[PDB]
Coordinates of C-alpha atoms and ligand atoms in Angstrom, one line a residue:
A1 CA 126.1 78.5 111.8
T2 CA 122.7 79.7 110.4
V3 CA 119.4 78.4 110.9
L4 CA 117.1 76.8 108.0
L5 CA 115.1 79.5 106.4
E6 CA 112.1 80.5 108.1
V7 CA 108.8 81.2 106.5
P8 CA 106.9 83.4 106.0
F9 CA 109.5 86.0 104.7
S10 CA 107.5 89.3 105.7
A11 CA 103.8 90.1 106.5
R12 CA 104.2 93.2 104.4
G13 CA 101.5 93.5 101.7
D14 CA 102.8 96.3 100.1
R15 CA 106.0 95.3 98.4
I16 CA 107.6 91.7 97.8
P17 CA 110.8 91.0 99.4
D18 CA 113.8 91.1 96.7
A19 CA 114.6 87.5 98.5
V20 CA 111.8 86.0 96.6
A21 CA 113.3 86.6 93.2
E22 CA 116.9 85.5 94.4
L23 CA 115.1 82.4 96.0
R24 CA 113.3 81.7 92.6
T25 CA 116.2 81.9 90.4
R26 CA 118.8 80.0 92.9
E27 CA 116.4 77.3 94.4
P28 CA 112.8 77.4 93.4
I29 CA 112.0 74.4 95.7
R30 CA 113.8 74.8 98.9
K31 CA 113.4 73.7 102.6
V32 CA 112.1 76.0 105.0
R33 CA 111.0 75.7 108.5
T34 CA 107.3 76.8 109.1
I35 CA 106.3 78.4 112.4
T36 CA 105.4 75.2 113.8
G37 CA 108.9 73.9 113.5
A38 CA 108.1 71.9 110.9
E39 CA 110.1 71.4 107.8
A40 CA 108.7 72.2 104.3
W41 CA 109.4 72.7 100.7
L42 CA 108.7 76.3 99.6
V43 CA 108.1 76.4 95.9
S44 CA 108.5 79.8 94.3
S45 CA 108.6 79.5 90.4
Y46 CA 105.5 79.5 88.2
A47 CA 106.4 76.2 86.5
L48 CA 106.9 74.3 89.8
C49 CA 103.9 75.7 91.6
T50 CA 101.6 74.9 88.8
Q51 CA 103.0 71.6 88.9
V52 CA 102.4 71.3 92.6
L53 CA 98.9 72.6 92.4
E54 CA 97.7 70.3 89.3
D55 CA 99.2 67.3 90.8
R56 CA 96.5 66.0 93.4
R57 CA 99.0 63.9 94.9
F58 CA 100.1 66.9 96.8
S59 CA 96.9 66.9 98.8
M60 CA 95.3 69.4 100.5
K61 CA 93.3 66.8 102.5
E62 CA 96.0 65.0 104.0
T63 CA 97.5 68.2 105.4
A64 CA 95.0 67.6 107.9
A65 CA 96.4 64.2 109.0
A66 CA 97.2 64.0 112.6
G67 CA 101.2 63.9 112.9
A68 CA 101.8 65.6 109.5
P69 CA 104.2 68.5 109.2
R70 CA 102.2 71.7 109.5
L71 CA 102.5 75.0 108.3
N72 CA 100.2 76.2 111.1
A73 CA 97.8 74.9 113.3
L74 CA 94.1 74.1 112.3
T75 CA 91.5 76.8 113.2
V76 CA 88.8 74.7 111.8
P77 CA 87.8 70.8 112.3
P78 CA 90.1 68.6 110.3
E79 CA 87.3 67.3 108.1
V80 CA 86.8 70.7 107.1
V81 CA 90.1 71.0 105.3
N82 CA 88.3 68.5 102.9
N83 CA 85.6 71.1 102.7
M84 CA 85.2 71.2 98.9
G85 CA 85.3 67.4 98.6
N86 CA 82.5 66.9 101.2
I87 CA 80.4 69.5 99.3
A88 CA 81.2 67.4 96.1
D89 CA 80.6 64.1 98.0
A90 CA 77.1 65.4 99.0
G91 CA 76.1 66.4 95.6
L92 CA 76.1 70.0 96.3
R93 CA 79.0 71.4 94.5
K94 CA 77.1 72.8 91.4
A95 CA 74.6 74.4 93.5
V96 CA 77.1 76.1 96.0
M97 CA 79.0 77.2 93.1
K98 CA 76.0 78.7 91.3
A99 CA 74.9 80.6 94.3
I100 CA 78.3 82.3 94.8
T101 CA 78.4 83.9 91.5
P102 CA 78.3 87.6 90.8
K103 CA 75.2 86.6 88.6
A104 CA 72.2 86.8 90.7
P105 CA 69.8 89.5 89.9
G106 CA 70.5 92.7 91.7
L107 CA 73.7 91.4 93.3
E108 CA 75.8 93.8 91.3
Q109 CA 73.6 96.9 92.2
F110 CA 73.6 95.7 95.7
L111 CA 77.4 95.9 95.6
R112 CA 77.5 99.3 94.2
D113 CA 75.2 100.6 96.2
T114 CA 76.7 99.5 99.1
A115 CA 80.2 100.7 98.1
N116 CA 78.7 104.1 97.2
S117 CA 77.0 104.6 100.7
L118 CA 80.1 103.3 102.6
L119 CA 82.1 105.9 100.6
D120 CA 79.4 108.8 101.1
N121 CA 79.5 108.2 104.8
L122 CA 83.4 108.4 104.7
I123 CA 82.9 111.6 102.6
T124 CA 80.6 113.0 105.2
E125 CA 82.8 112.1 107.9
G126 CA 85.8 113.8 106.4
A127 CA 89.2 112.9 105.5
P128 CA 91.2 110.8 107.0
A129 CA 89.0 107.7 106.5
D130 CA 90.2 104.1 106.9
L131 CA 89.8 101.9 103.7
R132 CA 90.0 98.7 105.2
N133 CA 88.0 98.9 108.4
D134 CA 85.3 101.4 107.0
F135 CA 85.2 100.3 103.3
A136 CA 86.7 97.2 101.9
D137 CA 85.8 94.8 104.7
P138 CA 82.5 96.2 105.4
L139 CA 81.7 95.8 101.5
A140 CA 83.0 92.1 101.7
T141 CA 80.9 91.6 104.5
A142 CA 77.9 93.0 103.2
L143 CA 78.5 91.2 99.8
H144 CA 78.7 87.8 101.5
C145 CA 75.4 88.3 103.6
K146 CA 73.7 89.2 100.6
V147 CA 75.2 86.2 98.7
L148 CA 74.5 83.9 101.8
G149 CA 70.8 85.3 102.0
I150 CA 71.5 86.1 105.7
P151 CA 70.6 89.6 107.4
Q152 CA 73.0 92.2 106.9
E153 CA 72.8 93.1 110.6
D154 CA 74.2 89.5 111.3
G155 CA 77.4 90.4 109.2
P156 CA 79.3 92.1 111.7
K157 CA 79.5 89.3 114.3
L158 CA 80.5 86.7 112.0
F159 CA 83.2 88.9 110.4
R160 CA 84.5 89.5 114.0
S161 CA 85.6 85.8 114.1
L162 CA 87.9 86.2 111.2
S163 CA 90.6 88.0 112.9
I164 CA 91.1 84.7 115.0
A165 CA 89.8 81.9 112.5
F166 CA 92.5 83.1 109.7
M167 CA 95.3 83.2 112.1
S168 CA 98.6 81.2 111.1
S169 CA 99.6 80.0 114.4
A170 CA 102.0 77.5 115.8
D171 CA 99.4 76.3 118.3
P172 CA 95.7 75.6 118.2
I173 CA 93.7 78.7 119.1
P174 CA 90.9 78.3 121.9
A175 CA 89.1 81.0 120.7
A176 CA 88.8 79.5 117.0
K177 CA 86.9 76.8 118.4
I178 CA 84.7 79.1 120.3
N179 CA 83.8 81.0 117.6
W180 CA 83.6 78.1 115.0
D181 CA 81.0 76.5 117.5
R182 CA 79.1 79.6 117.6
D183 CA 79.3 80.5 114.0
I184 CA 77.8 76.8 113.1
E185 CA 75.2 77.5 115.6
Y186 CA 74.2 80.5 113.9
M187 CA 74.0 78.9 110.5
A188 CA 72.1 75.9 111.8
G189 CA 69.5 78.3 112.8
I190 CA 69.9 80.0 109.5
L191 CA 68.7 76.6 108.0
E192 CA 65.9 76.3 110.2
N193 CA 64.8 79.9 109.9
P194 CA 61.7 80.4 107.4
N195 CA 62.8 83.6 106.6
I196 CA 65.9 82.7 105.0
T197 CA 64.9 81.8 101.5
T198 CA 67.5 83.5 99.2
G199 CA 71.1 83.2 98.3
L200 CA 73.3 80.4 99.1
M201 CA 71.7 79.6 102.7
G202 CA 68.2 79.7 101.2
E203 CA 69.1 77.4 98.4
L204 CA 70.9 75.1 101.0
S205 CA 67.8 75.0 103.6
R206 CA 65.7 74.1 100.5
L207 CA 68.2 71.4 99.5
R208 CA 68.3 70.1 103.2
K209 CA 64.6 69.0 102.6
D210 CA 64.8 67.7 99.5
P211 CA 64.8 63.8 99.2
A212 CA 67.9 63.6 97.1
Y213 CA 69.9 65.2 100.0
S214 CA 68.3 63.4 103.0
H215 CA 71.3 61.9 104.0
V216 CA 73.7 65.0 103.9
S217 CA 74.4 66.2 107.4
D218 CA 73.1 69.2 109.0
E219 CA 76.5 69.9 110.0
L220 CA 78.1 69.9 106.4
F221 CA 75.3 72.5 105.6
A222 CA 75.9 74.9 108.4
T223 CA 79.8 74.3 107.5
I224 CA 79.1 75.4 104.1
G225 CA 77.7 78.6 105.1
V226 CA 80.3 79.3 107.8
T227 CA 83.2 78.5 105.5
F228 CA 82.2 80.4 102.4
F229 CA 81.4 83.3 104.7
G230 CA 84.8 83.4 105.9
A231 CA 86.8 82.3 103.3
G232 CA 84.9 84.9 101.0
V233 CA 85.0 87.9 103.7
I234 CA 88.7 87.5 104.2
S235 CA 90.0 86.9 100.9
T236 CA 87.9 89.8 99.2
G237 CA 88.3 92.1 102.0
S238 CA 92.0 91.7 102.2
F239 CA 92.6 91.6 98.5
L240 CA 90.6 94.8 97.8
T241 CA 92.4 96.4 100.6
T242 CA 95.9 95.8 99.2
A243 CA 94.8 96.1 95.8
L244 CA 93.5 99.7 96.7
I245 CA 97.0 100.1 98.2
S246 CA 98.9 99.1 94.9
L247 CA 96.5 101.4 93.0
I248 CA 96.9 104.4 95.4
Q249 CA 100.6 104.1 94.9
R250 CA 100.1 104.3 91.2
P251 CA 98.5 107.6 90.5
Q252 CA 98.8 107.3 86.8
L253 CA 96.8 104.3 87.0
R254 CA 94.2 105.5 89.5
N255 CA 93.7 108.3 87.0
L256 CA 93.6 106.0 83.9
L257 CA 91.1 103.5 85.8
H258 CA 88.9 106.8 86.9
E259 CA 89.3 108.0 83.1
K260 CA 88.4 104.7 81.5
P261 CA 86.4 102.5 84.1
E262 CA 86.2 99.9 81.3
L263 CA 89.7 99.1 81.9
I264 CA 89.0 98.4 85.5
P265 CA 88.6 94.4 84.9
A266 CA 92.0 94.5 83.5
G267 CA 93.3 96.6 86.0
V268 CA 91.7 94.1 88.7
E269 CA 93.0 91.0 87.2
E270 CA 96.9 92.6 87.4
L271 CA 96.3 93.8 90.8
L272 CA 95.0 90.1 91.6
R273 CA 98.2 88.9 89.7
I274 CA 100.7 90.9 91.8
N275 CA 98.5 90.6 95.2
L276 CA 100.3 89.6 98.3
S277 CA 97.4 89.0 100.5
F278 CA 97.8 85.3 100.9
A279 CA 100.8 85.3 103.6
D280 CA 101.8 81.8 103.5
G281 CA 102.4 79.3 100.5
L282 CA 99.4 77.4 100.0
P283 CA 99.9 73.8 101.7
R284 CA 99.9 70.3 100.3
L285 CA 101.0 66.9 101.7
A286 CA 102.7 64.6 99.4
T287 CA 101.0 61.2 99.2
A288 CA 103.8 59.7 97.0
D289 CA 107.7 60.4 96.3
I290 CA 107.2 63.1 93.7
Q291 CA 109.9 64.8 91.4
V292 CA 109.7 68.8 91.5
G293 CA 112.5 70.4 89.9
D294 CA 115.4 69.1 91.6
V295 CA 113.8 67.7 94.6
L296 CA 112.5 64.5 95.0
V297 CA 109.5 65.4 97.4
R298 CA 109.0 62.4 99.8
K299 CA 105.8 60.9 100.8
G300 CA 104.3 62.6 104.0
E301 CA 106.3 66.1 103.7
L302 CA 104.5 69.3 103.1
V303 CA 105.0 71.6 100.2
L304 CA 104.1 75.2 100.2
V305 CA 103.2 76.8 97.1
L306 CA 104.1 80.6 97.2
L307 CA 101.4 82.5 95.2
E308 CA 103.7 85.4 94.7
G309 CA 106.7 83.1 93.5
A310 CA 104.5 82.3 90.4
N311 CA 103.1 85.5 90.1
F312 CA 106.1 87.6 90.0
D313 CA 108.0 84.9 88.1
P314 CA 109.6 86.8 85.1
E315 CA 109.7 83.7 83.2
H316 CA 106.0 83.9 82.9
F317 CA 105.0 87.7 83.5
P318 CA 107.9 89.7 82.1
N319 CA 108.5 92.9 84.1
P320 CA 106.7 91.3 87.0
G321 CA 106.3 93.9 89.1
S322 CA 104.8 96.4 86.7
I323 CA 100.7 96.4 86.1
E324 CA 100.4 96.1 82.5
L325 CA 96.7 96.0 81.4
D326 CA 97.8 94.4 78.0
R327 CA 99.5 91.1 78.9
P328 CA 98.8 88.2 76.7
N329 CA 98.4 85.9 79.7
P330 CA 96.4 88.1 82.1
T331 CA 94.4 85.6 84.0
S332 CA 97.1 82.9 84.1
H333 CA 98.4 84.1 87.6
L334 CA 97.5 82.0 90.5
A335 CA 95.8 84.5 92.6
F336 CA 93.0 82.1 92.9
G337 CA 95.3 79.0 93.1
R338 CA 94.9 76.3 90.4
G339 CA 93.9 72.8 90.0
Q340 CA 91.4 70.8 92.1
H341 CA 91.3 73.5 94.8
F342 CA 90.8 76.5 92.3
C343 CA 88.9 79.3 94.1
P344 CA 85.2 78.7 93.7
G345 CA 84.3 82.3 94.3
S346 CA 86.9 83.7 91.6
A347 CA 84.2 85.4 89.8
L348 CA 82.5 87.0 92.8
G349 CA 86.0 88.1 93.9
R350 CA 86.8 89.7 90.8
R351 CA 83.4 91.7 90.9
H352 CA 83.8 92.8 94.4
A353 CA 87.1 94.5 93.9
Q354 CA 86.0 95.9 90.3
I355 CA 83.1 97.4 91.9
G356 CA 84.8 98.6 95.0
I357 CA 87.2 100.2 92.6
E358 CA 84.7 101.6 90.6
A359 CA 82.9 103.3 93.1
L360 CA 86.2 104.6 95.0
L361 CA 87.5 106.1 91.9
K362 CA 84.3 107.9 91.1
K363 CA 83.6 109.2 94.7
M364 CA 87.5 109.9 95.7
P365 CA 89.2 110.5 92.3
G366 CA 91.8 112.3 94.7
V367 CA 92.4 109.4 96.9
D368 CA 95.7 109.1 98.4
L369 CA 97.3 107.8 101.5
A370 CA 97.2 109.7 104.4
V371 CA 100.3 108.6 106.1
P372 CA 103.7 107.3 104.7
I373 CA 103.1 103.9 103.3
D374 CA 105.8 102.6 105.8
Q375 CA 103.4 103.7 108.6
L376 CA 101.0 101.3 107.5
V377 CA 100.9 98.3 110.6
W378 CA 101.0 95.0 108.9
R379 CA 98.9 92.1 110.6
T380 CA 101.4 89.4 111.7
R381 CA 100.8 85.5 111.9
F382 CA 97.8 85.7 110.0
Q383 CA 97.0 84.0 106.9
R384 CA 96.3 87.2 105.1
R385 CA 98.6 90.0 104.7
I386 CA 96.5 93.2 105.6
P387 CA 97.3 96.6 107.2
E388 CA 95.4 96.9 110.5
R389 CA 94.2 100.3 109.2
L390 CA 94.3 102.0 105.5
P391 CA 94.3 106.0 106.1
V392 CA 93.6 107.8 103.2
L393 CA 92.8 111.3 102.2
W394 CA 91.0 112.6 99.0
Ligands
LIG401 C1 89.8 88.1 95.6 C2 89.3 87.2 96.4 C3 89.7 85.9 96.5 C4 90.9 85.5 96.6 C5 92.3 86.2 96.3 C6 90.9 83.8 96.6 C7 92.0 83.0 96.7 C8 91.6 81.8 97.0 C9 92.7 80.7 96.6 C10 94.4 81.2 96.3 C11 92.3 79.4 97.1 C12 92.9 78.3 96.8 C13 93.5 77.8 98.3 C14 94.3 76.3 98.2 O1 94.6 76.1 97.0 O2 95.1 75.8 99.1 C15 90.9 79.7 97.3 C16 90.3 78.7 97.6 C17 88.9 79.1 98.2 N1 88.2 80.3 98.2 FE1 88.8 81.9 97.4 N2 89.6 83.7 97.0 C18 89.0 84.6 96.9 C19 87.4 85.0 97.1 C20 86.6 83.9 97.6 C21 85.3 84.2 97.8 C22 84.4 85.4 97.1 C23 84.9 83.0 98.0 C24 83.5 82.6 98.7 C25 82.4 83.0 98.7 C26 86.0 82.1 98.3 C27 85.8 80.7 99.0 C28 87.0 79.9 98.8 C29 86.8 78.5 99.2 C30 85.6 77.8 99.9 C31 88.2 78.0 98.8 C32 88.4 76.7 99.0 C33 88.5 75.6 97.9 C34 88.8 74.6 98.2 O3 89.2 74.0 99.2 O4 89.0 73.6 97.3 N3 87.0 82.8 97.9 N4 90.5 80.9 97.4
LIG402 C1 92.8 78.4 105.5 C2 92.4 78.0 104.1 C3 92.1 76.5 103.9 C4 91.3 75.9 102.8 C5 91.0 74.6 102.5 C6 89.6 74.2 103.1 N1 88.7 74.7 102.3 C7 87.8 75.4 102.9 O1 86.5 75.7 102.1 C8 87.8 76.2 104.2 C9 88.3 77.4 104.2 C10 88.0 78.0 105.7 C11 86.8 78.7 106.0 C12 86.8 79.1 107.1 C13 87.8 79.1 108.2 O2 87.6 79.8 109.3 C14 88.9 78.7 108.0 C15 89.3 78.0 106.4 N2 88.8 75.4 105.3 C16 89.6 74.9 105.0 O3 90.5 74.0 105.6 C17 91.0 77.2 101.7 C18 91.3 78.5 101.9 C19 90.8 79.6 101.0 C20 91.7 78.9 103.2 O4 92.0 80.1 103.3

């Protein structure tokens, strides 16, 4: 007697389990048990993953409903699962999205300067260097402070909420609320701080005092800052970290991008496609009975969209495990999701990784792992897959 297949399959972010391809082939929508004990449908083909993500009847909002089958425990207030809907309802979606593009004057230079400064410090200190804790995450953190308009020196404290905020836990996490409430208070103070005039929080601080937004809650303004800082920092830091691994493990690609940095955008797009940073399928709750492949998903059931199921689907990306800079459909992966909840920070996330990689390859053209790959320690029960340290030499 066997138990129902458990998700997630593996917290390792350096390789996809052979099991995913067998699952996709045999049962692209399959029942699984999540860490809470709930049952769910795990969708692992490109076609079915896009179907689910493009059908809003598979609702993100409704995953927060009391009594729903859960992937993991909420680490935010339930109304925050509807964060982008709340932002849209408040009339803030266009301004938010405009503030988080990589387009602001000087932002890319700041990113480059920050990356180069981080790297110089690593070079000064001498190998081995930890490229997660001492490069990718600080770069993500610095970027998001700059984007939000908040002091760089406030970044580390906000950052250290994230090892708990993005836990994938069977049970509510006491520290998540402590940190959430504290971080909200911080962002509320930011909105009241007259020195904060730039970035997302500077713009929100002005809109908050504009009569066209006088009935938007202060809670939502503060929430936008906390949520965009955290989702952005965890996602860019984790993605860049695991992209660096994939790059370091491909010396020929490393050398090609070092030699021809104009291919870095195509290389990052493939690193996005093969990225295993999201540790769990994206969750959605059926609000109707909906046919997905051979399964009639019933109203109230949980569906988990396995990004790497889609992104390594050979029917969509031939030779899926190979980084190919000349694919005909290069941005068609689901690394940034798809549909209603497509990542609003996609461009910023691309540029963060492009600039970080560009700077790394210039400063450390010899970069290599300083430990055997198997020695990386993969964070467990977390919504991202990340090695706790990424020791390199160069
Ligand atoms: C490479 C970096 C990133 C990756 C791989 C990534 C990935 C994703 C994915 C897959 C989703 C969809 C979640 C879902 O549908 O359930 C998403 C949503 C989101 N991302 Fe990104 N992300 C990245 C960078 C960023 C950045 C830089 C920001 C903000 C500055 C950000 C903010 C968000 C937010 C707020 C959402 C939720 C949108 C919503 O609920 O509708 N992300 N991200
Ligand atoms: C876990 C998670 C959820 C969403 C949907 C939704 N929308 C949001 O904007 C925030 C993101 C978030 C920010 C800070 C934090 O501590 C926990 C979650 N919360 C939500 O529930 C989206 C993404 C990308 C995600 O990783």
